C-alpha cells in the first residue's frame, strides 16, 4: 500500500458524536442576561424592569 | 395528502370587590363573600356558554 | 493641616416579572422563575463590577 490508512484520520475521531432523531435538529441559546439600562434608582423608588 | 393545524388558547376573567365595613356588619343572608363568589361563577358560566 | 471628608451611600436595584400563564405551561429548560432570578443576579453583578 502506497496510500494513507485509518491512523491518518484525526478530526473525525475527535469530534463528539450524538444521535439524531430527525432531519431537523433544534437547540436553544442564551445570549444576554438583560438590557444595559442603568442600575441606580434613588431612595424608595421602584426600579425599572428588564428582560433577557 | 396530510396537513398540520394549530389552536390558540385564550383568557377569561372577572373581578369582585367588597369593602371592609361591609364584612363587619350583620348579614341577613349569610356570608357575603360566598354570595359574591357564586355570582361571579354564574356570570362566567353564562359568558363562556355564549362565547362557545 | 487636617481635613474631614464625607461619602454618600448610593442605591442600586432592578425589577423582574413573569406572567401567570408562563408558569402554567411546560418548560424546556426547567423552572422559569429560578432562571429569571439567576439572570437578574448576574446582570446586577456585572453592573456593579462596571460601576466600580
Amino acid at each position: 500500500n502506497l496510500s494513507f490508512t485509518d491512523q491518518h484520520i484525526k478530526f473525525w475521531k475527535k469530534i463528539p458524536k450524538q444521535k439524531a432523531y430527525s432531519t431537523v435538529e433544534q437547540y436553544g441559546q442564551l445570549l444576554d442576561y438583560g438590557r444595559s439600562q442603568g442600575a441606580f434608582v434613588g431612595e424608595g423608588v421602584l426600579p425599572d424592569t428588564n428582560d433577557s | 395528502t396530510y396537513a398540520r393545524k394549530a389552536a390558540f388558547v385564550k383568557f377569561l376573567g372577572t373581578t369582585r370587590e367588597v369593602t371592609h365595613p361591609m364584612t363587619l356588619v350583620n348579614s341577613a343572608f349569610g356570608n357575603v363573600i360566598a354570595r359574591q363568589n357564586k355570582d361571579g361563577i354564574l356570570w362566567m358560566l353564562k359568558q363562556i356558554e355564549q362565547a362557545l | 493641616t487636617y481635613a474631614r471628608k464625607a461619602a454618600f451611600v448610593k442605591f442600586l436595584g432592578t425589577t423582574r416579572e413573569v406572567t401567570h400563564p408562563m408558569t402554567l405551561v411546560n418548560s424546556a429548560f426547567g423552572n422559569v422563575i429560578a432562571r429569571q432570578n439567576k439572570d437578574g443576579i448576574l446582570w446586577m453583578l456585572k453592573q456593579i463590577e462596571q460601576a466600580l
Binding site: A20, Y21, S22, T23, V24, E25, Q26, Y27, G28, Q29, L30 | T1, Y2, A3, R4, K5, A6 | A28, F29
Partner: peptide, 29 residues
C-alpha cells in the same frame, strides 16, 4: 415518494414532513 424535505414551519408540512416530531435538546446553551 414519502420524504422529509427540511421544512421548519409546522403549518407548511406536507407528505412525509407531517410524520415528524421536533428534536429539541433539553439543555440550554
Amino acid at each position: 415518494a414519502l420524504e422529509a424535505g427540511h421544512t421548519v414551519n409546522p403549518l407548511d408540512l406536507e407528505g412525509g414532513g407531517a410524520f415528524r416530531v421536533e428534536s429539541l435538546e433539553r439543555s440550554l446553551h
